[PDB]
Amino acid sequence: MQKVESIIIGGGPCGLSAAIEQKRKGIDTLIIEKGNVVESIYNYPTHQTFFSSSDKLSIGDVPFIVEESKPRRNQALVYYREVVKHHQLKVNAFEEVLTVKKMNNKFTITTTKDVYECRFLTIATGYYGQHNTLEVEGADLPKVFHYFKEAHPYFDQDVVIIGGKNSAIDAALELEKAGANVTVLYRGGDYSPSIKPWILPNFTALVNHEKIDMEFNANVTQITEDTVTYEVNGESKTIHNDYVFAMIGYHPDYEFLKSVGIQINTNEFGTAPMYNKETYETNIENCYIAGVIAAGNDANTIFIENGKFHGGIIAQSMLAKKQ
Amino acid sequence: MQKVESIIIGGGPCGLSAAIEQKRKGIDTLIIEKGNVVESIYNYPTHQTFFSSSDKLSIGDVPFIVEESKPRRNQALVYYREVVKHHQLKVNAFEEVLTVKKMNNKFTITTTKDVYECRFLTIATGYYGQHNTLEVEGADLPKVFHYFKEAHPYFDQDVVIIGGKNSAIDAALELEKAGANVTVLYRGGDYSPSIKPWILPNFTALVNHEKIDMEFNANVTQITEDTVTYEVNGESKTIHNDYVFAMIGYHPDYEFLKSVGIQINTNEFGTAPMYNKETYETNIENCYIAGVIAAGNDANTIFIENGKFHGGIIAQSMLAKKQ
Amino acid sequence: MQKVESIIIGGGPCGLSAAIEQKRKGIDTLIIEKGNVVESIYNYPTHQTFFSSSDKLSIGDVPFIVEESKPRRNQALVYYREVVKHHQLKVNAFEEVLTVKKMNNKFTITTTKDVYECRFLTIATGYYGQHNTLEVEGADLPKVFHYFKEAHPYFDQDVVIIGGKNSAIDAALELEKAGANVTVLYRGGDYSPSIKPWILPNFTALVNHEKIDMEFNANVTQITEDTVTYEVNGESKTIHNDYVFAMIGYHPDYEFLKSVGIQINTNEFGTAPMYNKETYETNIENCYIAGVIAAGNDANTIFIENGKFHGGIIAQSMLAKKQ
Amino acid sequence: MQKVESIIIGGGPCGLSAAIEQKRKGIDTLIIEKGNVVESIYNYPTHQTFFSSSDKLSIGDVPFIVEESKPRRNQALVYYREVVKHHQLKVNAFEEVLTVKKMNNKFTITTTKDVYECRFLTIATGYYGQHNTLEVEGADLPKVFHYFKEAHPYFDQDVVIIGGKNSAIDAALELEKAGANVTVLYRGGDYSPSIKPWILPNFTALVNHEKIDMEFNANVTQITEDTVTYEVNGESKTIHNDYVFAMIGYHPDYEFLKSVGIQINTNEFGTAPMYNKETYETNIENCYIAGVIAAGNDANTIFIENGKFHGGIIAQSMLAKKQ
Ligand SMILES: Cc1cc2nc3c(=O)[nH]c(=O)nc-3n(C[C@H](O)[C@H](O)[C@H](O)COP(=O)(O)OP(=O)(O)OC[C@H]3O[C@@H](n4cnc5c(N)ncnc54)[C@H](O)[C@@H]3O)c2cc1C
Ligand SMILES: Cc1cc2nc3c(=O)[nH]c(=O)nc-3n(C[C@H](O)[C@H](O)[C@H](O)COP(=O)(O)OP(=O)(O)OC[C@H]3O[C@@H](n4cnc5c(N)ncnc54)[C@H](O)[C@@H]3O)c2cc1C
């Protein structure tokens, strides 16, 4: 098979950051990535603009420099590739990790392509592969999406967005610009505080001009092939509808985490894996986590700017157990 | 059922132009589009730049104005949508025509959503949905694509491009920029003349700096999941290969075209459908074609710049038959 | 000399707008523009982003279409030229009007290039060309600018911005992004309400992170070659300083407006010329005004969006007067 | 009155490269830049696109990374500012060096702000600040420019471009897209080979579609207030003309080079300073040159790509001379 000192699952920004810092401390690493590096950013909507300036998205002392104040999706793609190039990272792409088992102070990794054995393990699988379940009648119709890519094809289509965070407001602005008839249905009373303060004004101006319908305290009750039905303050309303974007968030793959022996916890920030806040070691010895996997659900506690510092934390602890 | 004077199958640029021009002659028309309007352009590679200046893509008295010299893919999308808004065109999107039958002096159109009855029929389906077949061992593996979209995921992958015209050279530049190891295998003796003269220098410079492998007189003989084997002057070579981009062109849906009763016609121009060069009417009375479909095989006869003129021709002939 | 029915001083969007609508009524016009068309937009800062969507900046039967939400400076430049091209407008560029006198029912216009005589006259000279006078010691130093263009050359220079409106806040973000040490000195107590609600948060963040110095209740008292001295509620502070941006607003050339015989007003809200409100005719018979020059009495501002509608009103009144 | 070990005159890319390389070897450096860093690039036409990929513009191990194939002008500005920050280079901006004289183990440098005294001097003044003399009647009219910035204000004006290299060809394209009536007058027989091969096809298409006038073997004889008169193989022609773009090249400031005591000496290829090819030291001990100024006699061209390597070679010779 293959024997590597350390393996990292996930080549997102926090996984990449983990490999660099371990390499800086002389630990030979291998990143195993289900897609290619930073698939998450690759799957952003085409025109997405980050909300961090780009120095705050940079990892391992390769500067992320762009003329705009905030960088776009494709600039991050070009940046993180250069990071891999510059740090000479060993990346196994298009190889999904399917099973991890610990065996006599060693890990046994089974992927869709090979079998590996390693001493240190780092799970940076993030949360984007598992979208929250909608739970209304019709939530499985193919007209329902949990991801937004481009708005052009929904030109002159009656579209509904369920949810109220940055994904919801981003998609509605883009869909309105492309000629969809957009209805946002949000179950809260007022705009979520996590919508970034320099975006909400562009969205709110359009709802005031009767160009987008914004409904608060709205819960969707039924989705058919050509209608959506929602209730507001008890009152049920039914509107014609061609497509539904369920922008209701994501969550980590807990099945995968449990099957390696990692515990769920429920504490200050919700259901999170068990880990040593000071070193990021989990209950399974020599198994670390990095990235938004450490936060759990609340997609506003850990992003790239804080998550990229895990790797350095992991490196100190991994180097320490080298007596 | 549904009764319309005129139906146009295809909401690409040529379909749209045909609708405008018929409407200008007092003909009530309906576009039935399997996707949404200008799906073709919607399915271009993401960062694609047109080779036409943008005055030459403009249709139906809506000026296409951009600050760049040649427009990018997303600008055309914004533009063609506005064309539909301005000209109040009826487009039934996400509705594939499945069957056309002639009965008395009326056509009966069966789609995935309804049945229509019309006097005049205009097939503007273009050729991008039907790719030329590779015809080598391994062409059905999932590592073989006939459409290029974005290059990032092929970062650090060993990629082979089959073909020689603008699709191959566009995709090679984009894949090289994204850090792939690109090998172009072209069955010709020299660069195809139809590659645009302001792109080619960017390709050859990278070729001359040994950044892309370019092979002439090369025919691919086998594709396995991790190799490609091709012949050059009889000599066989086998190189490791992760993905294959078969940029060998596209062709009209001749099955659908025959199933309505239209004759295929062996010309010394490239075997195309039967049509009156002066009116674009087929062998079936009141059934016209417009767009690149009238070119047949070669794709250097009809593009948007001239193909957008069929509409004006067809409208005259339909008006001659009156109503 | 030269004899034209109607003359328009000013080829900004509102001057151009007046010409199109008068021409639509079969009235011959000539635009005399001190620069070339839309010089004002041309003298915007290089990277300036309009605050309107681009349909609200469109004039005269030419759609303003862009893929972004709000268009950039050069997109409007490209656009307003096509408006002139499409409407075949006579424009005499690089010709400043210096002198207007009434004799009979006829005007005699004296420019730096010719002498003109016309029946209808429209003064659409806007306000961007005459900056408010600073009125501090040192305001004549060459280090004092009343216009912002690009920020690069102020890299690692100590810069002061006088003012607190959109010009001041835009210029500060640009200068900070380019590495200047920026101090904004504003004579008010809080952020001006006219700062766009989607821009302010980016500025506010930089102030809170000590990347820009923001001083309220700040009045500048002296500018020397290498210091700036200001008072904050009376206490004097003096800082090292390399350049000064007095973004303290603009005003129409009222000198020119009186020198033809038009009364100003100065009343409560502001200070504007006399005009009929229903025709936009001034106290001088057959003398109209258009554009932001008409702002001042009314408790509203005039941007391109509402100001461009003057032209239509003007055309009717000129159409009533026949001739 | 101020004392530094080494001084570099010129803060363009090759000067900056010199400072980094000297700093890597422990030499105290100071850049004196008449403008701010990379003023030459700052004075490019607003929309200039480099012809180098951006890897080749990188200096001192700060990677220049951009999503597009060739970088634009403002990206080069953003990058070179980040190099100065990243290495912490001392740059005294807006301080023109007027005089250098040799005295003892020291140079005495006179600028418009101070006097310096140093051991090592590196003159990296480039050529973009000194335009070749036009030397025809009218070359001093204000309608004659030796620098191109933006094309919009020349909308619908009669423009003449003198020259035949990329500056002329770039300017013609930018001036044609903005609606000028462009006549390029070149004293040569055919297109200059130095025009980049992916740009020439865009100009040629415009010449062939009679939208730009291109005249070969044309020499300009007179510039009047509103005409230009040129001879083509002796035949005289006179055309109406509003502005003149003398894109006839540039040259290093050779007086300044002589006034320090460095010998210039012309050949084939041109005139260059006298210097050792292995150390880049001039005839004056401890006075080096860097950048395109070293071009002239070598029959080789010096761009940012090759010119940026002087600094390292110069650092060796300076370090060899020890302390
Ligand atoms: C539209 C949008 C905009 C955003 N903007 C910002 C922003 O401006 N700033 C910011 O800080 N954050 C932003 N984020 C959040 C950002 O995406 C995350 O914070 C970041 O990706 C978390 O890092 P990670 O490496 O943990 O996640 P990921 O990038 O998701 O890393 C997980 C990676 O591991 C791979 N993987 C998963 N399971 C397996 C498996 N079993 N085997 C192998 N590989 C596997 C995945 O394919 C993926 O590439 C944004 C998110 C979205 C959706
Ligand atoms: C990468 C790339 C770059 C190009 N650049 C240029 C360029 O710069 N200039 C230029 O002139 N051309 C360019 N082209 C070619 C351009 O796409 C064609 O000229 C043009 O798209 C043909 O227009 P059309 O409407 O005739 O066919 P299409 O554009 O393909 O439109 C046909 C439409 O019919 C729909 N359809 C098909 N079958 C059915 C059915 N049964 N029922 C309903 N709808 C159906 C399809 O979904 C499609 O939307 C480019 C092509 C590619 C691939």
Ligand SMILES: Cc1cc2nc3c(=O)[nH]c(=O)nc-3n(C[C@H](O)[C@H](O)[C@H](O)COP(=O)(O)OP(=O)(O)OC[C@H]3O[C@@H](n4cnc5c(N)ncnc54)[C@H](O)[C@@H]3O)c2cc1C
């Ligand atoms: C940085 C900035 C951003 C802005 N953004 C927006 C925005 O997003 N949306 C918006 O609606 N507005 C915006 N504005 C305001 C906009 O510039 C004005 O509303 C607009 O210019 C009004 O046009 P106008 O035709 O009245 O006059 P102007 O545009 O000022 O044009 C007057 C013209 O007449 C010429 N002229 C003046 N005097 C004479 C004379 N004596 N003889 C001959 N010619 C003369 C001038 O040179 C000029 O070309 C912005 C302004 C600035 C400074």
Ligand SMILES: Cc1cc2nc3c(=O)[nH]c(=O)nc-3n(C[C@H](O)[C@H](O)[C@H](O)COP(=O)(O)OP(=O)(O)OC[C@H]3O[C@@H](n4cnc5c(N)ncnc54)[C@H](O)[C@@H]3O)c2cc1C
């Ligand atoms: C339109 C255009 C496009 C170009 N595109 C490219 C391209 O794609 N790739 C490429 O490699 N090159 C390109 N060039 C050329 C490129 O600008 C030069 O290679 C580059 O400027 C060389 O830099 P340098 O280090 O010699 O110093 P320069 O860039 O020439 O400048 C030296 C500096 O010295 C300063 N200085 C001058 N006199 C004094 C003084 N007395 N005291 C103090 N400071 C002084 C100047 O202000 C200037 O900042 C282009 C040039 C132009 C005009």
Ligand SMILES: NC(=O)c1ccc[n+]([C@@H]2O[C@H](COP(=O)([O-])OP(=O)(O)OC[C@H]3O[C@@H](n4cnc5c(N)ncnc54)[C@H](OP(=O)(O)O)[C@@H]3O)[C@@H](O)[C@H]2O)c1
């Ligand atoms: N720089 C950065 O850190 C950065 C940048 C960009 C984006 N982001 C993150 O990306 C997020 C985008 O939103 P998201 O896609 O992740 O959504 P999310 O955070 O999961 O929340 C989606 C919204 O939908 C509602 N919702 C959830 N489940 C629902 C159900 N079953 N039925 C009906 N409504 C439901 C929620 O209401 P409640 O409000 O009641 O929970 C919530 O407001 C932002 O919120 C931000 O956290 C971060």
Ligand SMILES: NC(=O)c1ccc[n+]([C@@H]2O[C@H](COP(=O)([O-])OP(=O)(O)OC[C@H]3O[C@@H](n4cnc5c(N)ncnc54)[C@H](OP(=O)(O)O)[C@@H]3O)[C@@H](O)[C@H]2O)c1
């Ligand atoms: N510049 C651009 O942005 C751009 C990009 C892509 C496409 N386009 C336009 O879009 C259209 C289609 O693009 P395209 O370039 O993919 O199609 P194409 O122009 O037909 O290109 C096909 C290429 O593959 C080779 N080939 C054809 N059939 C083959 C087979 N059966 N087996 C192996 N090799 C084969 C051809 O060789 P021969 O040369 O010997 O025929 C040719 O080089 C054209 O109008 C094109 O101009 C423009």
